[PDB]
Symmetry: D2
Subunit: 332 residues, 4 copies
């Protein structure tokens, strides 16, 4: 058995050499993960289900856990005295940590991914993206430190709260998965080099929004449903409704997750900086691919803190098929 | 706070008056649920993921947890000295408990529902159906005690192993949900009278098998995707891949679960006695509806222990729509 | 592995044949045990340490946990609808359960034994004594049902909250020990027939009260300290300060627990009905002995609900030595 | 709420300024503490009770947990890549960690204190002492780095596995206590500046070894038993049999722990380096006193790795009384 902490110590060569800082960063993450896990694991008996009475900066009806997760992760990150500030999907502005002007890291987060699944005992998660600041240390970080392109991330990962609670991350040298052991109260390594299998046979998308999908996506969907054993078609459909959850399964069994533009979300629903970039960094480290249907997610220059974007991620051949259909059937 | 055990004591009028027997029956269930929960909650750290090397009587590639769950629930039921025998989706024949010829109850079970989700940290469950034997007490039960129609069940329910572990059941007087509290090691009441909301806006089906669905189901699907605010359309799509899990969400938020006949499963994939009947008894007690697309699931006279059947379950208006389309578009 | 519940089902011949009632009784016990264990296991982080601001009917400064334990066990017993009423070391009068006039059992309890050890993370426990009522069923129990001699107990046992939480009990056919498994949330059998070893080498007493002990006890103490290998002397001294805890160790390794009359407690400190009788029933079922220094604890006719009594319990030869010294050195 | 990790970050001024190193050191400690806690918390259900079949370098019959604890803590310390080597009460020689010649810290430990209490569900503990090496970094530590006087410790503390699991330590700026929360899987601060109360009224000693105690100790004992309200006498007696446990209680309620020379242990039973020094450093930081009956424990120049020593520790006035009686009654 090897804990997450010991693994971080072990892999000194990773993280651009800062072992002690990576430890503090992930220590804050798992602390927050543990705190959140506790409430979720007893959701029905704990008063955490339902709307908090506030509306997201995303223009969404916030749930109580969303806020709880937000505050806990935020306090956990501020207490390690290692981050200068954070950006969160539940916050309107960036949060500058007072007294941390000295810190050289910033963290972008999606505190509780899969809000719709909280009340129904279905998998939810947490997503984090870590960047090295660009502004002068000793000064308060600015949006400039939060609008860097995905290819500049020094770390990214997620926590999935499912039948078991796992923490998955990368620093640019493969994707490592750790499982929380309630018997010990520690995260243990369960898979050091996660990689998408050779071929994927599952597509994850909200087919209820069919009519409003780009014509290329509609065609790809039809493609998935055609019969062709030579290529494992028709594919199996799986859509949990939680990004972290569907991503995790697809990484283990192979598959693709799709969230294109719809009527309600002209530019896709997911957010570039809190959801797309971190998951793209992960998908790529696993030998997969992630694009907005045309260009590489990690190379997109962010325009606004809460910018949204179409997202297609998973096995390379599958994502490549999507890109080809959009190419052959551009939506007029 | 009120535990499952205290609730059973409290609701004396339910279960056709046998409080002490209902307690023993569910005591075996939660014991098995707890044992299974333990392994699943640490799946990655425990050697339980993967094929066991055997093939189901369903002609399926059995997973290790499937067997584990089977043996544990079976031993738990035999140890309460309250059941004469069991039938299981993982067993070829009925299991007659030696020394229990005196018992007057039989239990049909789906030890581990959602086998495909075990290795990917996604929700799985357990389904149980309880019948009062028809054969003379003191004698070994026969298939006759296991082939009774669904309307004869004296109890049914399920265990869902998701972000939290819950036990949901009914004895004919509403559906009660209990959440397991790891802090206490007990199941606590969290919802006494679960009922489907007035309207449902979600459909759960494996759309990858589209081309092979009955034409009426294909039409219903298209219907779900049309735009019509007056009727909350298009609906949201959600398909976890675990029957228990999708059912649970639909019962709480409203929706319909569909598993019609396909090329691989001419008579639907789900099994009448271990999956359809218990979930139909539950759906009905919640004010919902469950049919095979034409007739009431609970009134079907079972022909074989492992008989399969098309299954449409959830909000009544939604299930009624499915039945209407199959009616208007009979598949030639 | 075999749980407490399954063991009770198994040993049908015990408990004067009432399996279903013994199950309900102990089910209430472990529920209360679990609830108490939860707070104690996190005592430092939970606001439960310190005086509650009330004085025991024992004329003692009550601690918060004492009351918590009292209320929880009381509510747990009332909710099983199996007990007509209870008597407790923390209550002035007997508690008659409204609506349970039909119940035929009464329970006497010491909700939290070892009050002085609660704040210092040291072992504490719970003691229960179960009697069959003597008053007409259908009527409210009276003190008469609570003042029966110890030899009339149909059951007795204790819960020890130490490095691990165990439940030890007897119904007149040996002493059975069960350990709580936090991983499963169930009590598992760990020792079916506990018996004192052949010889004991440990004495448990509060030697700080030496000068005020009966002269016979002072002599026994000196005896324990003499050197004599032929008889394993001098003995080892062990006094945890918690009756349940010192008893448990002595039952496993052999030894004697002593609490004679002192200046502050002319008739010993322990209470006959809530502490002495149950532990005496247990000690005897393990092949041990329990007396007030002269006569058999279990045969004493109780005079008052809160009567106190000298208590010497453990290996028979050791208790016999105490009785001999008191005999040879009667305190004038 | 504040975790142990966050507290360490917070108190930068302590530990002679090495926050990142103190974190790694205690991280290894709690990991080991957690691992040990897991087995102990289920001792009866886990095969860990009983002799391992080997004899300590102490000439004692080793128990299975003793060895388990030893190996786990040892592996946990080696995996942090922060310690050059360790000395343990269960090891004959010092353990030099290969590949850690670069580390500048050494740890002396008593992996499992209170071996006699393991099988009887009574409190046990773990003791650690941390020193900064004296030998040239880059070279393998030698006994010289392990035979430094107690006053050179840069850190010390213990883990007590009782009704709850706590971690208590000091780096020279007061004694801090943390409680493990099984609900979260983290150690939380529960008391930042533990101090002995003004006066103590409890003495902890194995009075079974009376006849062989130094005459001064025999007199002190008699003193404790005299009646004198003006000075809270006679004192209460408490002796759990576990050093860590009796120490903890005495620190919270006030008292003294005594283990003088006996027939079997001419130089006391406790070991200077693994038991006396760390507990003396702790007692002193709490405003208490610790001596061998004549001189200050922390100033004694260690002669051998496994040197034993008389130990009197707790409230200053009580320890001072012991020293006075030994002075007035030197044992001829
Ligand atoms: O309800 P739809 O439109 O399918 O959106 C589902 C997607 O939205 C997200 C957004 O984070 O969930 P949610 O809005 O419920 O938080 C993703 O986790 C998920 O993949
Ligand atoms: O893979 P598909 O064909 O969608 O089948 C999913 C359905 O099959 C079942 C059968 O029990 O899961 P599984 O076969 O993986 O055990 C249901 O739980 C689930 O709803
Ligand atoms: O403090 P002293 O007088 O030794 O009393 C200890 C005895 O008293 C009892 C009484 O129950 O503890 P406590 O009063 O602290 O509750 C026994 O558990 C214990 O054996
Ligand atoms: O059995 P006695 O001689 O009282 O020794 C008890 C003392 O010895 C120690 C030594 O560590 O316990 P143990 O030998 O059982 O490990 C101390 O923890 C305890 O205070
Ligand atoms: Mg999200
Ligand atoms: Mg199934
Ligand atoms: Mg008591
Ligand atoms: Mg020790």
């Amino acid at each position: 058995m090897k804990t997450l902490g010991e693994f971080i110590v072990e892999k000194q060569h990773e993280f651009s050499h800062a072992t002690g800082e990576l430890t503090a960063l992930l220590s804050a993450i798992k602390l927050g993960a543990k705190i959140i896990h506790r409430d979720i694991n007893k959701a029905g008996l704990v008063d955490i289900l339902g709307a908090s009475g506030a509306e997201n900066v995303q223009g969404e009806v916030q749930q109580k856990l969303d806020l709880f997760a937000n505050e806990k992760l935020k306090a956990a990150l501020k207490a390690r005295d290692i981050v200068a500030g954070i950006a969160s999907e539940e916050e309107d502005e960036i949060v500058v940590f007072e007294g941390c002007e000295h810190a050289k890291y910033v963290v972008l987060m999606d505190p509780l991914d899969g809000s719709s699944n909280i009340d129904v005992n279905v998998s939810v998660g947490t997503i984090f993206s870590i960047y090295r600041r660009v502004t002068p240390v000793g000064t308060p970080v600015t949006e400039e430190d939060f609008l860097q392109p995905g290819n500049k991330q020094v770390a990214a990962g997620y926590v999935v709260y499912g039948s078991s609670t796992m923490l998955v991350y990368t620093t640019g040298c493969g994707v490592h998965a750790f499982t929380y052991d309630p018997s010990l109260g520690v995260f243990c390594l369960c898979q050091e080099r996660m990689r998408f299998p050779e071929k994927g046979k599952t597509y994850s998308i909200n087919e209820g929004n069919y009519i409003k999908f780009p014509n290329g996506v509609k065609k790809y969907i039809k493609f998935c449903q055609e019969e062709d054993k030579s290529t494992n078609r028709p594919y199996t459909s799986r859509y949990i409704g939680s990004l972290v959850a569907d991503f995790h399964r697809n990484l283990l069994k192979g598959g693709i997750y799709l969230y294109p533009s719809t009527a309600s979300h002209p530019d896709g629903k997911l957010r570039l900086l809190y959801e797309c970039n971190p998951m793209a960094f992960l998908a790529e480290q696993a030998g997969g691919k992630a694009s907005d249907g045309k260009e590489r997610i990690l190379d997109i220059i962010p325009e606004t803190l809460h910018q949204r974007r179409s997202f297609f991620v998973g096995n390379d051949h599958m994502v490549e098929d999507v890109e080809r259909f959009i190419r052959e059937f551009p939506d007029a």
